Structure formats: structure tokens, C-alpha cells
């Protein structure tokens, strides 16, 4: 019931890096360099 602070603080208090946080929460879109990108049909739903 104290003052609130951003959630990510606790994750960093659990020995987590930004890379790991993003790996856990967000998915990944790859890009290649011409300037080609791999496409997944399901990703571009709209």
C-alpha cells in the first residue's frame, strides 16, 4: 500500500536485463540487408 513505482523496477531487482525483459514480454521481427525482410503470413493480419 506504499507509493507505486514502475513495474520493470522489480524485474531489474530480480537480476534481469532489458534484453531478457523484451524476450519474455515481446515477440521479435527480423530484418536483413537489398533491404530484405523475412515475412510470416500470420503476422500481417491487418
Partner 1 sequence: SQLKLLVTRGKEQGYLTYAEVNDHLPEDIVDSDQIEDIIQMINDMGIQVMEEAPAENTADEDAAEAAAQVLSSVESEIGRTTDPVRMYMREMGTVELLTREGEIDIAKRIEDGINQVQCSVAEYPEAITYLLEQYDRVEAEEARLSDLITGFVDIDPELAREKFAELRAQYVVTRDTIKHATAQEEILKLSEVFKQFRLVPKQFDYLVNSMRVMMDRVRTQERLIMKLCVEQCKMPKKNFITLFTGNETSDTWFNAAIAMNKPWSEKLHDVSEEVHRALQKLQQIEEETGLTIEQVKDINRRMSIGEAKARRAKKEMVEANLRLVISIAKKYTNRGLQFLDLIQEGNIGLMKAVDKFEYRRGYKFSTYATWWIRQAITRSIADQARTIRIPVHMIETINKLNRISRQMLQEMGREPTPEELAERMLMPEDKIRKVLKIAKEPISMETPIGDDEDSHLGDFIEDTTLELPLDSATTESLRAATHDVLAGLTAREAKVLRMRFGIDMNTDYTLEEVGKQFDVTRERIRQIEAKALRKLRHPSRSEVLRSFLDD
Residue 2 in contact with partner 1, rule: CB under 8 A = yes
Q: Does 45 bind partner 1 (CB under 8 A)?
A: no
Euclidean distance between CA atoms 22 and 18, whole angstroms: 6
Q: Does 3 bind partner 1 (CB under 8 A)?
A: yes
34 binds partner 1 (CB under 8 A): no
Query: Which of 27, 25, 29 has its CA nearest to residue 37?
Result: 29
Q: Does 6 bind partner 1 (CB under 8 A)?
A: no
Q: Can you give the binding site for partner 1, defined by CB under 8 A?
A: 1-4
Amino acid at each position: 500500500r506504499r507509493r507505486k513505482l514502475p513495474a520493470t523496477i522489480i524485474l531489474r531487482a530480480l537480476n534481469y536485463t532489458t534484453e531478457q525483459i523484451l524476450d519474455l514480454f515481446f515477440e521479435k521481427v527480423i530484418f536483413e540487408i537489398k533491404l530484405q525482410m523475412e515475412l510470416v503470413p500470420e503476422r500481417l493480419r491487418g
